Design a protein around this ligand. Sequence first.
Ligand SMILES: [Ca+2]
Ligand SMILES: [Ca+2]
Ligand SMILES: [K+]
Ligand SMILES: [K+]
Lengths: 837, 837
Amino acid sequence: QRQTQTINDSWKFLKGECTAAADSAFDDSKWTSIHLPHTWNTDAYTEKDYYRGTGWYRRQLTLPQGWKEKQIILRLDAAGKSATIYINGKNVGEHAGGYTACSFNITPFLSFDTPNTLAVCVDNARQDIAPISGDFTFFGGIYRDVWLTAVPNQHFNLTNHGSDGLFISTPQVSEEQATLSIRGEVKNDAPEKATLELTHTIYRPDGTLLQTLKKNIQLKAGETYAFSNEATPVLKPELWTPETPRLYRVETTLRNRKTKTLLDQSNHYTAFRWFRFDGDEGFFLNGKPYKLRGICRHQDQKPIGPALTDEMHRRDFLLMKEMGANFIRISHYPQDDALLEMCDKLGMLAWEEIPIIDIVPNTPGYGDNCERNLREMIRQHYNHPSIITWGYMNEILLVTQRKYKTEAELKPVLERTLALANRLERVLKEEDSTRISTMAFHGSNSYNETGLSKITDIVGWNLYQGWYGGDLTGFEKFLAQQHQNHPTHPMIVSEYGAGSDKRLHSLHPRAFDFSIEYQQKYLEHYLPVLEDTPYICGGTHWNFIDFSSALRDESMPRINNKGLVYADRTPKDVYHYYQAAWRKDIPVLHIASRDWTDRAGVQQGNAPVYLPVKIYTNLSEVELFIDGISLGKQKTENYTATFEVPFSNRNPFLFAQGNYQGKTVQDGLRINFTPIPACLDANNLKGLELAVNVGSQCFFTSDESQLTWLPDQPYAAGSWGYIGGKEGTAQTEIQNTADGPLFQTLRNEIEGYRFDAPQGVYEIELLFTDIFRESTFGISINGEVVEESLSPCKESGYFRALRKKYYITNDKEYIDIRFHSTSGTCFLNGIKLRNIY
Amino acid sequence: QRQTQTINDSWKFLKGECTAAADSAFDDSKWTSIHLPHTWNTDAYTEKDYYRGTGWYRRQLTLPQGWKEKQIILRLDAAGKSATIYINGKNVGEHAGGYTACSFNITPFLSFDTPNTLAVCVDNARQDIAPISGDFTFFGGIYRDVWLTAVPNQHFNLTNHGSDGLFISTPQVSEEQATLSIRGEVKNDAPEKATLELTHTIYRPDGTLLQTLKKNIQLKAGETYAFSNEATPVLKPELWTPETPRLYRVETTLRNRKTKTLLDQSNHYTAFRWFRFDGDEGFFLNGKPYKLRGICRHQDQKPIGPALTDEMHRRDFLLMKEMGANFIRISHYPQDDALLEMCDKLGMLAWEEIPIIDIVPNTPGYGDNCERNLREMIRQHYNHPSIITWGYMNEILLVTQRKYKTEAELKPVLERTLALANRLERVLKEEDSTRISTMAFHGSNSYNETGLSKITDIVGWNLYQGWYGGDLTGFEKFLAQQHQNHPTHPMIVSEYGAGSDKRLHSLHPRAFDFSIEYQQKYLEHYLPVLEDTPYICGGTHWNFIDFSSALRDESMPRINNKGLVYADRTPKDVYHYYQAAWRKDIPVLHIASRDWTDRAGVQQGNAPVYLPVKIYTNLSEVELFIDGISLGKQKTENYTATFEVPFSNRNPFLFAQGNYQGKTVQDGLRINFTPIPACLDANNLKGLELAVNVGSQCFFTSDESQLTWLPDQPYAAGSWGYIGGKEGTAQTEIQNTADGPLFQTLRNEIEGYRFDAPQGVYEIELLFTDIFRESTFGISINGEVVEESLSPCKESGYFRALRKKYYITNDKEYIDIRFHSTSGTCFLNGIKLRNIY
Ligand SMILES: [Ca+2]
Ligand SMILES: [Ca+2]
Ligand SMILES: [K+]
Ligand SMILES: [K+]
């Protein structure tokens, strides 16, 4: 019989090279105790320069005596980026690739009456292994399951590109009938021949038997045997869709032909579906038009990296499925079996790819490792009915076009690129003729002009109009252009998204302020275009999660914040916009304010402060209440509705309801509101901490201090605000603060800041960061100099926070701060006023 | 005149020893760029052995030309645990004590032509500085503001024990009139004699001028002049309470006698109140009985330690004040001026102490440094009218009596201890006769038998009956016996609390399961005893926050989790228990399920799963709905009501309402519910992840995977559950897992675990941690051996997680897992079951 179990436990780990670390008798007691899955790159969640290099893993293998006559296969499901396996000091094998499995028959190197030592040397510094470039962290270590499989001396091949050795397909599929094809290899590692019986048992979705195939076979000592048995056509077969994931189990059994002793067994699922892509009418599943509703998903989770356990992969999947998605771009690398098991069983169409990104370098051996990862991916994930397309390149021209400008420089790189591309297209269709090929392009017509877009069956456009420049309307314009010029290339929008940050909100959202509201604006424009345009087969949203990308700065450094859920898998409000549009079966009513629970605003006297509250819903009409008071009904358009809500009380309870298919549907939540006075006097100063996000139109709420910094406002008599200057913005990371975004916007060429305020003693905090890589200025308040010559970049350097507090005695009816430029410009990034006496 | 500003910006930091790190011509370019406040000890949030030792801070000081003729005073508000300060390489001064400020006149060391170097050597290893022991982390670094103050040559004394140099008190206070005493010192740092005018301006709470006092003073060169001025008696003074914090501003001004030019100015608050502690009748404020409704507050915040900005101290105060507290025990050390400012101005009585804890060591200079720290605390904080008592020792016999059990070992230690207490009591009464002295005891009568309880004006008892032993009712019993045996000693319950973990919930809460429910049970019992016993002055709940204590393991290692709010200052549900009991002015209606948003339970058929939902409120009657369905109106007792709630749907909306003072009050929220079947079959197995918290009556929801592990249940025909064994519990930290509490409980001597499940292919995961520091045992599943000789402690060691996954083919109608001992005992800490095929 076959025994499969993990050996994820009882490991020792050492970061860095170490000579003698493979030896049986090496002393490792001072090493770190760990448990797989593991990564040594949690540093990538704070450090841009994460450790790329070597690390050593050691674990004892003490073999069970019942395995004395079995073959022992070791499987590493992934290790980034490469691994060399030692058993008792003997090199057993090596693997190149961070996202595909590898397996080794380790029987010869094992003892059965002594301890055996397993030692894995892992390296994520190697430049001959994909990816070498791309918008994510190249995490090092053994971050998927590690298995031991013991099998009898005759068994199915388990050392074919780390796969299961068996491959099931369906050559023909129609409403009326379909045909099955069960192929694989049997291996005999006994010293003598053997006569076997092979059995293929096929079960309907409902568990009952549909058919048994039997074929007797013989193998001589040390031979591997290739079979390929068609099956009786299945009549009126139950077809698979994401919505009806009908699966047929196929159980393949290997027994000794005389004694009928069971030897080895291996189960797989199969399904019956066909599909095509149409440059004019889109995607067709089982003959019917089918809009692909997709998201892409990276595999990491802050702060553990990609060392996820399998229930986390399943949790991720439940979230994408409850949102209503029917398609997933598994990108940019092949992901855990735990995930693909769910796309088959619970139902999701799948696109899977290997990470060849940005630029084909002239690195010796790169192309060859790429082709092996393509074969590994395809052979390992071949039996997953959910997968309908493989891909191998994503934006392969992006860095190439940035780094090479002349036609002379482009020439050799475009040739390398077009070569590797056609090569892999051939490797793909040689490994699998049942699925579609695909490539993903950044938003450039040069993928057409260079020839790259004639290569695959379908094309993916990564489109960011309205985020990385352009207009939101350029998105549908870019796609209509591609469709008139290239009407036979069927298109998927394989990427679109906008960053958001829970700390930032705006009544006037713009791109690259990273407010919750701009990302919503961007997605609310993109999604109907995807749903209502026939030559768009679908879109895959980039990305389902906020994910690790150590090289990024922007509002959340080390993080790509374009997710629909946060890194911990709490959903952003906009997740429920997708749900409203994609789940018609249930009611969706979501007050879109879980991202905006700590609100502030400038208050005229005692009048209520108006701030928008948004609702995502599939109901047609919704009514919103604040502390019991109705704010009327509103008809939904585009699954959304905004109310202008009067905030007053400090802990208001928001409540929404509406009718859906005859049932009443409700939602509610409490939030926090703090009014800030527009006109300071001695009463409203008690307990006031007036804090302004100078140079920005966003409310910034610290997640460290819970303080909200108000949008900048110009000075008006009776009130407070800035005098002169223009808004300035950076996306570079700011040292020495948790509150990056507050320092990344500033009022440049500022002339003053004024507070009309009563006489007294005041605490003034000034926030500076020089983002213009020289500025020197003096600061006076009510005619007294508080800085003679402040130069933030000479004190602290560029992109580094300075917070300076001053105690100020106001003997006037105002607090007038003036800036006196002497070099460069005057700038101010934030200001906070408190009355002390 | 006077200019005060921070120099928190533009610092360089190096951890560890460094030679010549003080020299101006040192190269610190490869040091770390940091911004004060800073601690080098964020490692304490993960590591138990956090680094204790030396750290170096360097800054350039470039002085304004307008300061050329002024005295520059440098003030460090805190450095843990000691600081030595260097100006341009020359030792300026030293300070011992991590929680009090220090100040130095650095004018003689500075130049105005060339830049200056400020270097600070900070050390958190010195054993001659308190604390040497105690249940919190001794963070190193400069974690409070650092100031420069430039003053003219005649100025108020700023180098008296780091204080403001002024001392204002009210020698007599009644409702009819009060006296006011305004004292301080003036320093003439000029080489020439000076003749000055000293002005005190006293303002009513409403801002109007009440009195101007004026005296001429004359100072020789270099002289320090002590003034003591008595104001006119204040008639019908506005009395201060936490509910009415009326403050009188005292403005003290120094003028050049001839030219009338203003030289220096210092503002302070005084207030008029008197208080009294009675052994029979408790606490009296301004003649009226007053119950002290207190909390304690540590000053750290995960993961930045004590390096809080001042708006974070203000945030903490607001939450404390919104809860209804009127008393804060500022422990175990004095804290930020930003905190005491809110106590005076927004209203909260205060006890403040220095950290002499656990054992008076036999260390030279420790007594001397404790005395210096007590003088510093009283002088630096003398002018805060909220402070009504000073303390200096907390549980000073706790470690003494653990370490020494023989009278010969105890005799010297008790003499050292009584000597220091008696020393510090007279220092306190020397420094401040306007305030009560206090000492906090652990739950032992030895404080009475040693005479420690005879030293201070009042005594505090730290009491944990129902947490660290005993029954809940032993709390009121311990207090009653104290009161009858020592009726003249007035009593505060100065610590009481119980740990809790958002991940743990129990329908049968018990001590040290760390469930949210047990902490509620404990506090629901303690609070009314505090409210209703007359001879209890009040209590200070331990603690307001979950806080850093590196030596703690238990359910959240490195964290003391007895908070009313989490480390990030999100409130626990029980925070609103206090709010309902203590706020009469606002309505309080809180569904107690923000701590329990991810529910799950065992479902019989399609019958609904019943789970308690608690409500905290000061309403007399509440009505709970679930998904629009009402569940009745309940009468509240002890500010709480519990409903038995039927859960079926996945995303239920809970809604609560009642009446308060005529108006309708509401609350509501969504949570998640996952039903787990009691009887497994083909249908309900698809999508099922049956996970069990073996050997515990707690639900455990992982905050990493979001999966809930069910309380254990014994096997029953047709269902699933354990067979044999007893429950076992460890508080030691579990290596190699984020889900510690799951692995801390187990079924010891277990015999099997069984699921009545259909035939198929199942994934079983078993969880192991040996907690008994030898067990070896075998495991079989339906008679198939899966482990011949598993010894968790031999493969991994004690208190380390093992997660083993097995794939098993089940030909039967049950899955039967049996354990077969060999050495030690069999055990299981967790089990999870999925159906693959
Ligand atoms: Ca896995
Ligand atoms: Ca401070
Ligand atoms: K700003
Ligand atoms: K357990």
